[PDB]
């Protein structure tokens, strides 16, 4: 569970991301595709080249869903309900891949927020990404 301290850390870090959220979402996807090549099997229909507008467009959707989740930290299951159905019944992404994207999102935040990414904020962000991942896979079976 996210403590009051965790929620404050997450809203503070994401607040600093601000309008750069979409750019960071695309960077996190590029990091994941390069570091963990197996994740590319879910995007055979995408041009995965660096600078690809399809990855930049998808990065923005992922980042917007995260912004929505931060705004509804106390009510994530309902805020992310359509996304849980989508991943559980259509996309069917194996659960292990959520840990790979979460790691790459963390690396992207570390690379962009040097002053904000303290050890305490790092721990809170990691807990937040595991909760989002838990919600998105709650309807798998």
């Amino acid at each position: 569970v996210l403590s009051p301290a965790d929620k404050t850390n997450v809203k503070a870090a994401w607040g600093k991301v601000g309008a750069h959220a979409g750019e960071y979402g695309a960077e996190a996807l590029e990091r994941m595709f390069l570091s963990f090549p197996t994740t590319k099997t879910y995007f055979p229909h995408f041009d995965l080249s660096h600078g690809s507008a399809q990855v930049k467009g998808h990065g923005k959707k992922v980042a917007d869903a995260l912004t929505n989740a931060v705004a509804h930290v106390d009510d994530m299951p309902n805020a992310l309900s359509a996304l849980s159905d989508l991943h559980a019944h259509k996309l069917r992404v194996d659960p292990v891949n959520f840990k790979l994207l979460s790691h790459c999102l963390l690396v992207t935040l570390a690379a962009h927020l040097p002053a904000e990414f303290t050890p305490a904020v790092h721990a809170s962000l990691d807990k937040f990404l595991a909760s989002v991942s838990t919600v998105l896979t709650s309807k798998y079976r």
């Binding site: 090549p37 197996t38 099997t41 879910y42 055979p44 559980a88 996309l91 069917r92 992404v93 194996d94 292990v96 891949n97 798998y140 079976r141």
Partner: protein, 146 residues
């Protein structure tokens, strides 16, 4: 994979009692029932709505025997799994887009099927030998991913 001569005989001995077509259909059907997201590659197989629909589906059965037949032939090359599954690895990555995590899930479902099928003959040491094999085959199939 490194198997002691005793682990190899344990694997081969039990395998000679396996009805490959039957166990193949059983393993793939259970994979699709227990981990439903694996159904993503099989939309053309038709009705996969319930556990009974999956187990009785003739296309699931036919694919199960194809998958287990290649696994069976691989047992004769336990010392060279990577070279034996190189082409199948490339096919699964480049054309089929199968996340390698699926191979690990199938391997664990196969171990449960063998335990259900053999009961007490599927001893803890025999399971350990089969665990190394399914991990070895999963790694061999994922080696050409890029």
């Amino acid at each position: 994979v490194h198997l002691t001569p005793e682990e190899k005989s344990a694997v081969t001995a039990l395998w000679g009692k396996v009805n490959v077509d039957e166990v193949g259909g059983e393993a793939l059907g259970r994979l699709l029932v227990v981990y439903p997201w694996t159904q993503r590659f099989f939309e053309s197989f038709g009705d996969l709505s319930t556990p009974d629909a999956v187990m009785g589906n003739p296309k699931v059965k036919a694919h199960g025997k194809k998958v287990l037949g290649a696994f069976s032939d691989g047992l004769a090359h336990l010392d060279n799994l990577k070279g034996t599954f190189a082409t199948l690895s490339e096919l699964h990555c480049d054309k089929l887009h199968v996340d390698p995590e699926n191979f690990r899930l199938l391997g664990n479902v196969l171990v449960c099927v063998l335990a259900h099928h053999f009961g007490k003959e599927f001893t803890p040491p025999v399971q350990a030998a089969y665990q190394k094999v399914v991990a070895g085959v999963a790694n061999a199939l994922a080696h050409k991913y890029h």
